[PDB]
Coordinates of C-alpha atoms and ligand atoms in Angstrom, one line a residue:
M1 CA 194.3 41.2 66.3
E2 CA 193.5 43.0 69.7
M3 CA 194.0 46.7 68.5
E4 CA 196.0 47.6 71.6
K5 CA 198.6 45.0 70.5
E6 CA 198.4 46.3 66.9
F7 CA 198.8 49.9 68.5
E8 CA 202.0 48.9 70.5
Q9 CA 203.5 47.2 67.4
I10 CA 202.9 50.3 65.1
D11 CA 204.2 52.6 67.9
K12 CA 207.4 50.6 68.6
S13 CA 208.0 50.4 64.8
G14 CA 207.1 54.1 64.2
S15 CA 205.0 53.1 61.2
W16 CA 201.9 55.5 61.6
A17 CA 202.7 57.4 58.4
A18 CA 202.9 54.0 56.5
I19 CA 199.5 52.6 57.8
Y20 CA 197.8 56.1 57.1
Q21 CA 199.1 56.1 53.4
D22 CA 197.8 52.5 52.9
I23 CA 194.3 53.8 54.0
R24 CA 194.6 56.8 51.6
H25 CA 195.5 54.3 48.7
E26 CA 192.6 51.9 49.3
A27 CA 189.9 54.7 49.9
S28 CA 186.8 54.8 47.6
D29 CA 186.7 57.4 44.7
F30 CA 183.2 58.4 43.6
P31 CA 182.1 61.3 41.5
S32 CA 181.3 64.8 43.0
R33 CA 179.8 66.5 39.9
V34 CA 177.1 68.7 41.6
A35 CA 179.8 70.1 44.1
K36 CA 181.9 71.3 41.1
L37 CA 179.1 73.1 39.1
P38 CA 180.0 76.8 38.6
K39 CA 176.7 77.9 40.4
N40 CA 178.0 76.2 43.6
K41 CA 181.5 77.7 43.8
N42 CA 180.6 80.1 46.8
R43 CA 178.9 77.1 48.7
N44 CA 182.3 75.3 49.2
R45 CA 184.8 76.3 51.8
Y46 CA 187.7 74.2 50.3
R47 CA 188.2 73.4 46.6
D48 CA 189.6 69.8 47.4
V49 CA 186.7 68.8 49.9
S50 CA 183.4 67.9 48.3
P51 CA 180.5 65.5 49.0
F52 CA 180.1 62.5 46.7
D53 CA 176.9 62.7 44.5
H54 CA 175.5 59.3 45.8
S55 CA 175.6 60.3 49.6
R56 CA 175.1 64.2 49.4
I57 CA 172.3 65.8 51.5
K58 CA 169.8 67.5 49.2
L59 CA 168.0 70.8 50.4
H60 CA 164.2 70.6 49.7
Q61 CA 164.0 73.5 47.3
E62 CA 163.7 73.6 43.5
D63 CA 166.1 76.7 43.1
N64 CA 169.4 75.0 44.1
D65 CA 169.4 71.9 46.4
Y66 CA 173.3 71.9 47.0
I67 CA 175.0 71.9 50.4
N68 CA 178.5 70.6 51.2
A69 CA 177.2 67.8 53.5
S70 CA 177.2 63.9 53.4
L71 CA 175.0 61.1 55.0
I72 CA 177.3 58.5 56.6
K73 CA 175.0 55.4 57.1
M74 CA 176.7 52.6 59.3
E75 CA 174.5 49.5 58.7
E76 CA 175.8 47.0 61.3
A77 CA 176.2 49.7 64.1
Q78 CA 172.6 51.1 63.2
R79 CA 173.9 54.7 63.5
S80 CA 173.7 57.6 60.9
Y81 CA 175.7 60.9 60.9
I82 CA 175.6 64.0 58.7
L83 CA 179.2 65.3 58.3
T84 CA 179.4 69.0 56.9
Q85 CA 181.8 71.9 56.6
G86 CA 181.7 74.9 59.0
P87 CA 179.0 77.2 57.5
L88 CA 180.0 80.1 55.3
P89 CA 178.5 83.7 55.5
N90 CA 176.3 82.8 52.5
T91 CA 175.3 79.2 53.7
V92 CA 174.2 79.8 57.3
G93 CA 170.5 79.8 56.1
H94 CA 171.1 76.5 54.1
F95 CA 172.8 74.9 57.3
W96 CA 169.7 75.5 59.5
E97 CA 167.3 74.4 56.6
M98 CA 169.2 71.1 56.5
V99 CA 168.9 70.7 60.3
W100 CA 165.1 71.4 60.0
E101 CA 164.5 69.1 57.0
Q102 CA 166.5 66.1 58.3
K103 CA 164.8 66.2 61.8
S104 CA 168.2 66.4 63.7
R105 CA 168.1 66.9 67.5
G106 CA 171.8 67.7 67.9
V107 CA 174.6 69.7 66.3
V108 CA 178.2 68.7 67.2
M109 CA 180.9 71.5 66.6
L110 CA 184.6 70.5 67.0
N111 CA 186.3 73.8 66.1
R112 CA 186.5 77.5 67.4
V113 CA 185.1 80.3 65.1
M114 CA 188.7 81.6 65.0
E115 CA 191.8 79.3 65.0
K116 CA 195.5 80.1 64.0
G117 CA 194.3 83.8 63.6
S118 CA 191.8 83.0 60.7
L119 CA 188.0 82.5 60.5
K120 CA 187.3 78.7 60.4
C121 CA 183.4 79.2 60.3
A122 CA 180.7 81.8 60.5
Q123 CA 179.1 82.8 63.8
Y124 CA 176.0 80.8 62.8
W125 CA 174.1 80.8 66.3
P126 CA 173.0 83.7 68.6
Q127 CA 175.3 84.7 71.5
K128 CA 172.6 86.4 73.6
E129 CA 169.0 85.2 74.5
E130 CA 167.5 88.7 73.6
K131 CA 169.2 88.9 70.1
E132 CA 167.6 86.1 68.0
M133 CA 168.7 85.4 64.3
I134 CA 166.4 85.5 61.3
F135 CA 167.5 83.7 58.1
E136 CA 165.4 85.4 55.4
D137 CA 166.5 83.2 52.4
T138 CA 165.1 79.9 54.2
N139 CA 162.4 81.6 56.5
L140 CA 163.7 80.3 59.9
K141 CA 164.2 82.0 63.3
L142 CA 166.9 80.8 65.8
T143 CA 166.9 81.8 69.5
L144 CA 169.4 81.0 72.3
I145 CA 167.4 79.4 75.2
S146 CA 170.3 78.6 77.6
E147 CA 174.1 78.1 77.7
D148 CA 176.2 75.8 80.1
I149 CA 179.9 76.6 79.9
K150 CA 182.3 73.9 81.2
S151 CA 186.2 73.6 81.1
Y152 CA 186.4 71.4 77.9
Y153 CA 183.0 72.0 76.2
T154 CA 179.8 74.2 76.1
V155 CA 176.2 72.9 75.7
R156 CA 173.5 75.3 74.4
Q157 CA 169.8 74.8 74.0
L158 CA 168.4 76.5 70.9
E159 CA 164.9 77.0 69.5
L160 CA 164.5 76.7 65.7
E161 CA 161.2 78.0 64.3
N162 CA 159.9 77.4 60.8
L163 CA 158.3 80.9 60.2
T164 CA 156.3 79.4 57.3
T165 CA 154.3 77.0 59.6
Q166 CA 155.1 78.4 63.1
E167 CA 156.3 74.9 64.3
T168 CA 159.3 75.0 66.7
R169 CA 161.9 72.4 67.9
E170 CA 164.5 72.3 70.5
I171 CA 168.1 71.7 69.1
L172 CA 171.1 70.9 71.4
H173 CA 174.5 72.5 70.4
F174 CA 177.5 70.5 71.7
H175 CA 180.7 72.6 71.3
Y176 CA 184.1 71.0 71.9
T177 CA 186.2 74.2 72.6
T178 CA 189.7 72.8 73.6
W179 CA 191.0 70.9 70.6
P180 CA 194.5 72.4 70.1
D181 CA 195.4 74.7 67.1
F182 CA 198.2 72.1 66.1
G183 CA 198.2 68.3 66.4
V184 CA 195.7 66.3 68.6
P185 CA 194.9 66.2 72.4
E186 CA 197.6 64.5 74.6
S187 CA 194.9 62.3 76.4
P188 CA 191.5 61.1 74.9
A189 CA 189.8 61.5 78.4
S190 CA 188.1 65.0 77.7
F191 CA 187.1 63.9 74.1
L192 CA 185.5 60.6 75.4
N193 CA 183.7 62.6 78.2
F194 CA 182.3 64.9 75.5
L195 CA 181.2 61.9 73.3
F196 CA 179.3 60.4 76.2
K197 CA 177.6 63.8 76.9
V198 CA 176.3 63.8 73.3
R199 CA 175.1 60.1 73.6
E200 CA 173.3 60.9 77.0
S201 CA 171.3 63.8 75.4
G202 CA 169.4 61.4 72.9
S203 CA 171.0 63.3 69.9
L204 CA 172.6 60.0 68.4
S205 CA 169.4 57.8 68.9
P206 CA 167.2 56.4 66.1
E207 CA 164.0 58.3 67.3
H208 CA 165.7 61.5 65.8
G209 CA 167.2 62.3 62.4
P210 CA 171.0 62.0 62.1
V211 CA 173.2 64.2 64.3
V212 CA 175.0 67.0 62.3
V213 CA 178.8 67.0 62.9
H214 CA 181.2 69.7 61.7
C215 CA 184.7 71.1 62.1
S216 CA 186.2 73.5 59.5
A217 CA 186.3 71.1 56.4
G218 CA 184.1 68.3 58.0
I219 CA 186.6 65.4 57.5
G220 CA 189.4 65.5 60.2
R221 CA 188.1 66.1 63.8
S222 CA 184.6 65.2 62.5
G223 CA 185.9 61.9 61.2
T224 CA 187.5 61.1 64.6
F225 CA 184.2 61.7 66.5
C226 CA 182.1 59.4 64.3
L227 CA 184.9 56.6 63.9
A228 CA 185.3 56.5 67.7
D229 CA 181.5 56.4 68.3
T230 CA 180.9 53.6 65.7
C231 CA 183.8 51.4 66.9
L232 CA 182.7 51.6 70.6
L233 CA 179.0 50.7 69.5
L234 CA 180.2 47.6 67.5
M235 CA 182.3 46.4 70.5
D236 CA 179.1 46.6 72.7
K237 CA 177.0 44.7 70.1
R238 CA 179.2 41.9 68.8
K239 CA 180.0 38.5 70.5
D240 CA 183.8 38.9 69.7
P241 CA 184.7 42.5 70.6
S242 CA 188.4 41.8 69.7
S243 CA 187.3 41.5 66.0
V244 CA 186.4 45.3 65.7
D245 CA 189.0 46.5 63.0
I246 CA 189.3 50.3 63.2
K247 CA 191.0 50.5 59.7
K248 CA 188.0 48.5 58.1
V249 CA 185.4 50.8 59.9
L250 CA 187.3 53.9 58.5
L251 CA 187.3 52.5 54.9
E252 CA 183.6 51.8 55.2
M253 CA 183.0 55.4 56.4
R254 CA 185.1 56.8 53.5
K255 CA 182.6 55.2 51.0
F256 CA 180.3 58.1 52.1
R257 CA 182.6 61.1 52.4
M258 CA 186.2 61.6 51.2
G259 CA 189.3 62.3 53.4
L260 CA 187.9 61.3 56.8
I261 CA 190.9 61.4 59.3
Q262 CA 193.3 64.0 57.8
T263 CA 196.7 63.0 59.4
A264 CA 198.6 60.0 60.8
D265 CA 198.4 61.7 64.3
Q266 CA 194.5 61.8 64.0
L267 CA 194.6 58.0 63.1
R268 CA 197.0 57.3 66.1
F269 CA 194.7 59.4 68.3
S270 CA 191.5 57.6 67.0
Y271 CA 193.2 54.3 68.1
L272 CA 194.0 56.0 71.5
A273 CA 190.3 57.0 72.1
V274 CA 188.8 53.6 71.2
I275 CA 191.4 51.7 73.4
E276 CA 190.7 54.0 76.5
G277 CA 186.9 53.7 75.7
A278 CA 187.0 49.9 75.8
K279 CA 188.4 49.7 79.4
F280 CA 186.2 52.5 81.0
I281 CA 183.3 50.2 79.7
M282 CA 184.9 47.0 81.1
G283 CA 184.9 49.3 84.2
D284 CA 188.6 48.5 85.0
Ligands
LIG301 C1 190.0 40.3 73.7 C2 190.7 41.7 73.5 N1 189.8 42.7 72.9 C3 188.6 43.3 73.5 C4 188.2 42.9 74.8 C5 187.0 43.5 75.4 C6 186.2 44.4 74.7 C7 184.9 45.0 75.3 O1 184.3 44.4 76.2 O2 184.5 46.2 74.9 C8 186.6 44.8 73.4 C9 187.8 44.2 72.8

C-alpha cells in the first residue's frame, strides 16, 4: 500500500495511537544483562533504556568494556548506525573512545544540552578553539577546528588525537538545534535538509565506520533520523518503491535497540518525513 494513502487513512480514522501500540506489542525482546550489572549503574542515564547484549558496542579495554550504545546493521539498505544515549559526566571519555575505535567520521546530535530546564547531556565537546579537552581516563585530546552556525543546525569540525600513538582524525559534529521541547516539528522540511547535509559530508558512507547518533536516551529523535534515512535509501534501490513498508523497517531496527520511536506523534512525523522526501527526489 502506497504509504501516503495509508497515512491519509490513519489520519482520517485518528488511529495513530492504535498503530503505535501494535508496533510496541510485536517488538523484539532480547536480554540486556551486561547493562544491568551493578558495576554499570552510573554508565546508564535511564534505568528503562539499555542496549541488548547481542548488538552492544564493546569498548576495547579489559577493565570494563560497557557503554550504553547499540550497532543497528540494515542489511538490504547497506547502512550501519551506532545509536547511543547523550553522554554522562563520567562517560564523556568512553564516548570519544568508542568514536575512535569504531572509525566513525560523523556524530549526529538531535538535542540541546539543556531542555525543559534540565540537563539532557554533558558538554562533551570544546566551545572555543583555544580551550581543548583532555580525557585522561581514555588518553584522547579533542580540539574545536571550526564552527558553522545556521538557523536550524550547527556543523563543527573537530580534531580527535589518540595521545598514545599521536594519530589524529577529523570528526564532523552535526547538531540539530531546533527540535521543540514538546512534540515534533510542524514540517519535516528542516529535518530533511539536515539529513541531506549529513549524507553530503560522507559521514553515512561505507568507507567510514558507522555514524554515531544520539539524543538524550538514544531511541526517540535518534530512531526518527535512522528510520527516515533507511526508508529513503530502500526507495532509491528497489524496483517497486511503493513496497517500502515503514512499520516493517521499524520492527527490523527494533531487533538491534529497544524503544526506537517513543510516541505516536514521532511515528506520524516519521511517515511525514519519508512522504515529503519521496517527492523532493521525484523532483515534483
Ligand atoms: C507508486 C507509489 N509509491 C512510490 C512512488 C515513487 C517512489 C520514488 O521514486 O521514490 C516511491 C514510492
